[PDB]
Design a binder for this molecule. Structure first.
Ligand SMILES: *[C@@H](CC(=O)NNc1cnccn1)n1cnc(-c2cc(C(F)(F)F)cc(C(F)(F)F)c2)n1
Length: 912
């Protein structure tokens, strides 16, 4: 039978609404199950209004069979088929006939059909129309009356699911789905009925009970429902906490919802230390895409619920915590979840209320800590307390004494030997310093000297046990702390003391190399240089422009080291082969080179005085890098060279234009040959290459007129290869570069005319080739813009030269028959008059980009329809725009609700 199903599937793929526009349903008039399975298969071959009215033929027979047949397998199959086709069957059939009553009385109460029957009702609940309001109300009230008998509220759904059979678990899931969907789409319908409120409480009670099922999927469904309900009630009246109607109706059970939320809170990402299944405390090692989304939903729900009632949230939390300190419920799981909840509602709340809540929370946590002696408990408590103080910079910035105590204890934790406590401490140290910079540098109340100095004077001891990654983390934190010091005369000394330890190591290594360069081949020396350069990169990332004070100190030695490592690795590769790059020592040297380039790129991207950058830093970099990049084989070419060139060109523009020819002489031709041959070989080099090309085109276009034309040929060839590419991102970048290049070249007279005569027809031919080929339909707007631009330039007469070399002819007419011939070649079946009309319209629309786009799209769509080809992807950008608009709207809404985003996530950093 499988072969028949596959053959029918393939036949359906061959344009069902054209080749087979439902007739087989007649055969069901013992065989009905075969029909139902066939349509079940068809239900996924279907992806608007695909002649959907003929689904009524399915529904009529389904009602007939449903109303009259007792064959349980057949009933199940028919119910499944209807479950699929409720997405399209006309509404005037489902809501008018005996359907709802028929299955709610005849099947929903029967185990053989319970799950499918409830799923069918879920799909009916999924219909979202203002019509049939009374039928929806009847559906919900009757379904509740049924499932009340079938699953009484007194049942402990947690236990029933945990020990329940597979079908029972599926029934619990389907009940959750039905309740969630129906209340989402019709709660206002139910709430408007005074007498039904008790049944609404029954639904809410079911939601509470089913929310306690452990399995992640069930709780995800319940959480989505709770998120919807909380959002709706919050938006009913978000400014206060008399009660509005809906909130008044839901309040009698909101408390249980908050208790559920706090009890079951998922792990935040910032918590590195977790309890392992074997009963021990360890650092986290894996992540799940489910966890992040579940945590985000959990945070949304709980922040909405807190906005609904602040006092009650405080009460709940403070009581759970008072309980766990008392030892009534002491357990790492409970404390972890409670502290995750305490940190998750960070923000929101209010200022004085947050202070009041956190004072008691910190007191209770400290006492709990001071009571538990076991090392595992001491780690769990420390981790949780770190998470709390990490998520509440608002509290810290108002209490200097506590902030200093937290920082000192965090340093004490940095020495703690436990697996993940050090990482927790350093990550929290960033989260503190980043969001509380000014307090560290400004002399606070009572103290004599800024806290940054107590850090720097003891930095070596503070970093006397850290893993190198944690060392870079800590240096980045200190970098943020210094970065806020506005006084340059003090910031320079702070930087010098700040960098003093790695600068000492650097000076030692440089002195050793000067005495003998062979030291650079020692793996330990290379590793230390890599660590120092990573520290410098992170410090530059933090401090920003003032980092030049440190950078200029070591710049020349850094480039000398780069040259020495370049020579070493190049000689090694030349002597022993390309695979030499795989050796750990060679990889470490390449890491040193990569970090040098990254440091320069990082500093330049934040520099604000391009003149001095061009004068001092650029020429040594070019001398040290370009020849190496040209000479090395692909296996040893650093893509960070291209990235740095992109960044430097972007920042400097006209100040570096004179150097562009050399850069292209060294890089361009060498790198291009690596990209073209095989697409996947060097994705990073490809990306950095097109970044460089876009930057130089945008900010240093005159360079293209300086380089020899034989190489500008390669530039245009690379751009054309770029937009003809298959992958979306590279094609988009190619189109952007092409359009910018046209705009730029339009401004230089002789260059404009020569470029037109040499390439205009080639570029147009390639653009129409890609458009007709449709291989990159997503960029059709850019294609329309480019085509319109060229059509305008020719139409306005700005192309003074005759495009045809051999024929004295008008440019407009010439381009007209040229594009007509091109279109005819692409699609030989097009008629002459059709193409003539299309080209005349297209030319007439050169002045209006949206109109041009829609004209071209309509022409291409009718070509597809002649070919019978799918037109869905030809509107892909529009649908993508819709998705982006929806996402941006959601983001816009979330920022309006305090607490949904972490204090370390909002761009709107409050003062201090
Ligand atoms: C409790 C253990 C402790 O802090 N001190 N025990 C002593 C004191 N004197 C002599 C002998 N033993 N404990 C565990 N964790 C914390 C704690 C952690 C943090 C954080 F920054 F790491 F999150 C901060 C603080 C605070 F509130 F700043 F004190 C305490 N305390």
């Amino acid at each position: 039978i499988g072969k028949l199903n596959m053959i029918l599937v393939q036949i359906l793929k061959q344009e069902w609404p054209k080749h087979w526009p439902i007739s087989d349903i007649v055969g069901a008039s013992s065989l009905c199950q075969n029909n139902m399975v066939i349509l079940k298969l068809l239900s996924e071959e279907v992806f608007k209004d695909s002649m959907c009215n003929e689904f009524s033929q399915i529904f009529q027979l389904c009602q007939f069979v449903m109303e009259n047949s007792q064959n349980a397998p057949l009933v199940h199959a028919t119910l499944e088929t209807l479950l699929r086709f409720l997405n399209w069957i006309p509404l005037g059939y489902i809501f008018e006939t005996k359907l709802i009553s028929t299955l709610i009385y005849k099947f929903l109460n029967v185990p053989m059909f319970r799950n499918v029957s409830l799923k069918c009702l879920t799909e009916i609940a999924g219909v979202s129309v203002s019509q049939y309001e009374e039928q929806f109300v009847t559906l919900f009230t009757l379904t509740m009356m049924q499932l009340k008998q079938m699953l009484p509220l007194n049942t402990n759904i947690r236990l029933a699911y945990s020990n329940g059979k597979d079908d029972e678990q599926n029934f619990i899931q389907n009940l959750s789905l039905f309740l969630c969907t129906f209340l989402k789409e019709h709660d206002q319908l139910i709430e408007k009925r005074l007498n039904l409120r008790e049944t609404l409480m029954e639904a809410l009670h079911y939601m509470l009970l089913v929310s306690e099922v452990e399995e992640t999927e069930i709780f995800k469904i319940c959480l989505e429902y709770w998120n919807h309900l909380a959002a709706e009630l919050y938006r009913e009246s978000p400014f206060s906490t008399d009660v509005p109607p809906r909130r008044q109706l839901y309040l009698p059970m909101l408390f249980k919802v908050r208790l559920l939320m706090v009890s079951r809170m998922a792990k935040p990402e910032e918590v590195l230390v977790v309890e392992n299944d074997q009963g021990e405390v360890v650092r986290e090692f894996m992540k799940d895409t489910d966890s992040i989304n579940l945590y985000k939903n959990m945070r949304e729900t709980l922040v909405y619920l807190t906005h609904l009632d602040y006092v009650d949230t405080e009460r709940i939390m403070t009581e759970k915590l008072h309980n766990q300190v008392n030892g009534t419920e002491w357990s790492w799981k409970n404390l972890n979840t409670l502290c995750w909840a305490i940190g998750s509602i960070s923000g929101a709340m209010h200022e004085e209320d947050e202070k009041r809540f956190l004072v008691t929370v910190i007191k209770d946590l400290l006492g709990l800590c001071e009571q538990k002696r076991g090392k595992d408990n001491k780690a769990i408590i420390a981790s949780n307390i770190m998470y709390i103080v990490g998520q509440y910079p608002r509290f810290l910035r108002a209490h200097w004494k506590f902030l200093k105590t937290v920082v000192n204890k965090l340093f004490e934790f940095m020495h703690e030997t436990h697996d993940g406590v050090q990482d927790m401490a350093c990550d929290t140290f960033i989260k503190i310093a980043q969001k509380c910079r000014r307090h560290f540098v400004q002399v606070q109340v009572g103290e004599v000297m800024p806290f940054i100095d107590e850090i720097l004077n003891n930095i070596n001891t503070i970093i006397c046990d850290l893993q190198p990654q944690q060392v870079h983390t800590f240096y980045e934190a200190v970098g943020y702390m210094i970065g806020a010091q506005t006084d340059q005369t003090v910031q320079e000394h702070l930087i010098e003391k700040y960098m003093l330890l790695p600068n000492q190591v650097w000076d030692s290594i440089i002195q050793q190399a000067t005495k003998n360069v062979d030291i650079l081949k020692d793996p330990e020396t290379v590793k230390q240089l890599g660590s120092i350069l990573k520290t410098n990169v992170r410090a530059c990332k933090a401090v920003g422009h003032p980092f030049v004070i440190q950078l200029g100190r070591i710049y020349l030695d850094m480039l000398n080291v780069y040259k020495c490592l370049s020579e070493n690795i190049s000689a090694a590769i030349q002597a022993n082969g390309e695979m030499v790059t795989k050796q750990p020592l060679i990889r470490s040297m390449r890491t040193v080179k990569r970090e040098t380039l990254k440091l320069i790129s990082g500093w330049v991207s934040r520099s604000n005085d391009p003149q001095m950058v061009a004068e001092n830093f650029v020429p040594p970099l070019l001398d040290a890098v370009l020849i190496d990049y040209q000479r090395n084989v692909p296996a040893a070419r650093e893509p960070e060279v291209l990235s740095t060139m992109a960044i430097i060109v972007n920042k400097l523009g006209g100040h570096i234009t004179a150097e562009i020819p050399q850069i292209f002489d060294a890089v361009f031709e060498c790198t291009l040959n690596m990209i073209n041959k095989d697409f996947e070989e060097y994705p990073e080099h490809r990306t950095n290459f097109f970044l460089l090309l876009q930057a130089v085109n945008s900010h240093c276009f005159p360079a293209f007129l300086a380089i020899p034309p034989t190489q500008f040929k390669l530039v245009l060839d690379s751009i054309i290869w770029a937009f003809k590419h298959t992958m979306r991102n590279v094609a988009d970048t190619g189109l952007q570069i092409l359009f910018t290049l046209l705009q730029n070249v339009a401004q230089e007279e002789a260059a404009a005319q020569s470029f037109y005569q040499t390439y205009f027809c080639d570029i147009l031919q390639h653009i129409f080739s890609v458009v007709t080929d449709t291989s990159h339909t997503a960029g059709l707007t850019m294609h329309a813009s480019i085509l319109a631009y060229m059509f305008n330039l020719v139409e306005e007469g700005k192309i003074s030269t005759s495009l045809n070399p051999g024929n004295p002819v008008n440019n407009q007419i010439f381009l007209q028959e040229y594009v007509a011939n091109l279109l005819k070649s692409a699609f030989p079946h097009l008629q002459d008059a059709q193409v003539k009309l299309f080209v005349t319209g297209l030319f007439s629309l050169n002045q209006d980009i949206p109109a041009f786009k829609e004209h071209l799209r309509d022409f291409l769509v009718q070509i597809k329809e002649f070919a019978g080809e799918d037109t869905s992807d030809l509107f892909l950008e529009e649908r993508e725009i819709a998705l982006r608009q929806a996402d941006e709207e959601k983001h816009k809404r979330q920022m309006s609700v305090p607490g949904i985003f972490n204090p370390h996530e909002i761009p709107e950093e409050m003062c201090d």
